[PDB]
Design a protein around this nucleic acid. Structure first.
Lengths: 194, 194
DNA sequence: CCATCAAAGAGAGAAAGAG
DNA sequence: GCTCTTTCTCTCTTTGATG
């Protein structure tokens, strides 16, 4: 249990819109964000839709009592989050900021540990429907890989030439033709072409 | 040039919510709109408010018996507007769309011919209230200009840091320190800062 | 420089709920 | 039985990040 009671200031790099995922307790609320310190950056799972007051790009927030998982962190109810005074510093150098927002290169993924959380905007080469799933074959200059997503309304419109924005996928394969899969909290958005 | 009785297809771009106004003849009604041909765009005074059937963005329409003034167009109850044939084209290039709808930069106005119509959302710098009007000194990154509008309820909601949306003001003075003036068909809306 | 995405803020139309 | 507000439903304008 990696719970961190200690506080921490963070410069919120990005916070996406809240979305619903059906799990157990019923419709769940959450969104995805990315934050930074002077040293490193992490991807966040924020389970309070109403915390969007706090997470705003370029905004600094002092976050207390957070869970800190494998490849990302977790801000939940048992936690607490507050604003910071003009007093707080926490300078994020460009390369951390820059690297925070980039879409990983496929070839870079073959070298990454599995469990690595992968977000990014990708180009769809082929797509093959399954019963409950969809196989998107995405490839950029560095090479190709494959991800298994969820079969539904908008991911149904996806075709060669479209792009997909993947969020909170996991690396389930590396090396030649690496693979990501869809998790509970993964979200994907289909960007039609031209 | 002058009254045009002839059929002109135009793409409706903007159309605003009708308002009421006064003359020596008493009360009147109208609304403001923006439409465009393939080559150019136009701001519209439509004084027959029933036209809100036809005037609606993205909708192609055809018009005759309207008037062509300096910087704008008049549509009276004596003209005619119609849903255009499925054959009609009116294919409007993005740069005209973008330019039809953008708030002009102040310094751009300094070089423009007087008798130009100006609409836009501007930042309010200072406000000196008069007896029959209010003098609004407005700014953007390009510079300053003064505007004399009407003194009233909503125009007096306005404070430094707020914004105002001006529709159909006319350029009175240009060059260094231009000024925009209110007229019968102008409108203004005050937006509270934050 | 320029093309693509994304999100907040403003505006309008139409819809649902309360005197 | 009917107007007057409160939502939402959608778009466009701006702006900022990304490649």
């Amino acid at each position: 249990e990696g719970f961190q009671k200690r506080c921490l200031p963070v410069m919120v790099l990005k916070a996406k819109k809240p979305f619903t995922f059906e799990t157990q307790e019923g419709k769940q609320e959450m969104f995805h964000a990315t934050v930074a310190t002077e040293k490193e950056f992490f991807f966040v799972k924020v389970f309070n839709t109403l915390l969007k007051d706090k997470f705003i790009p370029k905004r600094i927030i002092i976050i207390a009592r957070y869970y800190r998982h494998s490849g990302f962190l977790e801000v939940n109810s048992a936690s607490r989050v507050l604003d910071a005074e003009s007093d707080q510093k926490v300078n994020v150098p460009l390369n951390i900021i820059r690297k925070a927002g980039e879409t990983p290169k496929i070839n870079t993924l073959q070298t990454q540990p599995l469990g690595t959380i992968v977000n990014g905007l990708f180009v769809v080469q082929k797509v093959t429907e399954k019963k409950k799933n969809i196989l998107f074959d995405l490839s950029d200059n560095t090479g190709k890989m494959e991800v298994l997503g969820v079969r539904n309304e908008d991911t149904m419109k996806c075709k060669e030439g479209d792009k997909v924005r993947l969020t909170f996928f996991t690396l389930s394969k590396n090396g030649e033709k690496l693979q990501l899969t869809s998790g509970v909290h993964s979200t994907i958005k289909v960007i039609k072409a031209k």
